[PDB]
Amino acid sequence: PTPVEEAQQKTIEAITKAINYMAKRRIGALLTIERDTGMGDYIETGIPLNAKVSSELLINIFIPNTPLHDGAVIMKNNEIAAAACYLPLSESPFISKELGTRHRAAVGISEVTDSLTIIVSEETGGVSVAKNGDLHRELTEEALKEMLEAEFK
Template sequence: MSIGNFNLFDLLINAIDILLVTFVIYKLIMVIKGTKAVQLLKGIFVVLIVTLISDKFHLQTLNWMMEQVLIWGVVAFVIIFQPELRRALEQLGRGGFFSRSGHQEEDEQEKMVEAIVKATDYMAKRRIGALISVERETGLADYIETGIPLNANISSELLINIFIPNTPLHDGAVILQKNSVAAAACYLPLSESPFISKELGTRHRAALGISEVTDSLTVIVSEETGSISLTKNGELHRDLKLDKFRELIGAELLSGVKAKQTSSGRWNWRGKANG
């Protein structure tokens, strides 16, 4: 049986080929999701669009520049995306590249929120200083590399144990990545804002600093007062009660209908005493 110049077998092979390529591209996108590679990909698309426009309107100098960028872009791509390519190969070797993803995300997020809230409540009552940063769209790989890698499942017990005073990992930040404890004792950039209250210590400045350069969500427990604070997008909200803290962090991290219902207007904190 044939249709034009193609028989049914050829059409089936072509359809399978297209589906496989689509699936591989989708899995690659899932690998780089949540890293700085997303922003870099946006830059590549901009270069491609500029190249097409310069070619159409015969902008020769600009077109030549864009062609050079694309020619050398292959080498730059390998260098820039080296961490993501390595992670993709590692997942392929572990057999995790083709595993299902996303279906359990909400349950995992709920468990993570519960672990953070429980650990924060325990440490706040006992005035155990803590700094926990949750990776979101912008990758935190650069800061994870400054700490001690753990790659452990998130639990309130683990978070509490890390921050117990005089233990090897208590000094520094814990970074949570993809529903796991990626690393502890990490160094975060300190905010240089002149508007930060002088009564705030290094933990609060570090939490503000990471929130100014990434979209991460960072929890601070004060060692002096036991107060709970939260930072996002360069904003600091201090002295949160546990119920308010649970509500805010849940609205930011939980997916689905619950997050959509509670997230509206939760971060309009400019009117309250910041920093």
């Protein structure tokens, strides 16, 4: 592997480890990975971090009833750009009706960007991904990893 490839895999591993912990504890989480469409306008609504990715920091951000847990983490250029960011709520009538604003925010940003958003449900610990206006629900660890690898390829 090359340095860039090793860094991308390290980030994927850090994300999957954090998602796994939050799924087990049913910690709600919203993590958007910026791609070609710039999301500076949304990054600026949150608390600036520009931090190195780690599973530890991702977990610490989303602990319930803490300053940073409300809103989205947005990643950009292999860093955590900001936390507690606003994302637009989808008005799509085709999202499962049992899901709340976290999933609607993920779908909403995916309607106006090429980003990939990961959601952990606080009700079930289920893991889903929003891209292109669609929500892919009930993902296994292997399925999330495949989506992250496809996105970065």
